[PDB]
Amino acid sequence: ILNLQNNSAKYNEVHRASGGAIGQYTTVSKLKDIVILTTDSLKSYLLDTKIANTFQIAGIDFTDHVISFDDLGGVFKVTKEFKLQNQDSIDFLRAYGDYQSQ
Amino acid sequence: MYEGNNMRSMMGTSYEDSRLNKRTELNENMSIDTNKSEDSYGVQIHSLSKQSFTG
Amino acid sequence: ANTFQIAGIDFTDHVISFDDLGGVFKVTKEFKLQNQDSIDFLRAYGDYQSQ
C-alpha cells in the first residue's frame, strides 16, 4: 500500500489486453478503492502484532481494508477435456445436487 | 416500438421482465458483526445464551 | 498486559478453563469385578451397589 498511489505503469497488467500488448499505461488509486485479499492467519498476525505491539497506531491501522477467508483454495479447475465413465462418479456428483450429469 | 399484441402468457410478460422477489443478499450480516473479533474488555464469563433452536 | 492496544481485541470473556482436564476414565474391553480391595476402594467413593 502506497506503492499504489504513485504514478506508475508497473502495477497494471494492460499488456494482456488485445490492442495494448507492448507499451505502458500509468494509473493510480485513491484509498477508497484498495482492498487486500488474504487468508485469516496473517490477518490475525496483523490483529495482534502490528496493532497491539505498535505503541502509536492511530493513523496506521489499515485492517479496515482487509477481507480474509479460511482457505484460499476449495475449488477445482479442469485442464484436459474428458468424459464420465464411472457410476460412483455419478453418485458422488448427485450427492452435491448435480442430477443431470450422466 | 412495435405493439402487435403484447398479450402472451410467457414471452409476453416474461420476455421483457418479471418480479424480482428474493434478492440473495446479506441480511445474515457477515463481515460486519460477523467476522468480528472486536469485543469488549473486563470482568468476564457467561455471555453465552442458547435458544430452543427449532428454527 | 505487555501489549498496548487491547481496546477491542480481548477475547477473554469467552474463555472458560480448568485446573487439569482429566480425572476421568473410560472403560475398554468390558471386564468384570473379581478382587476384594477393588470394590473396597469403590466403597470409599459411595459406590456400594457393585459386588
Binding site: 505503541f55 502509536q56 497506531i57 492511530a58 493513523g59 | 469488549s40 474488555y41 473486563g42 470482568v43 468476564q44 | 498496548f4 492496544q5 487491547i6 481496546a7 470473556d13
Partner: peptide, 16 residues
C-alpha cells in the same frame, strides 16, 4: 493541516 491524536499515556481500561 490536521493532527492525529497521540496516546502517550493511554493504557485503556474497560468494563463489562
Amino acid at each position: 493541516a490536521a493532527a492525529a491524536a497521540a496516546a502517550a499515556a493511554a493504557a485503556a481500561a474497560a468494563a463489562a
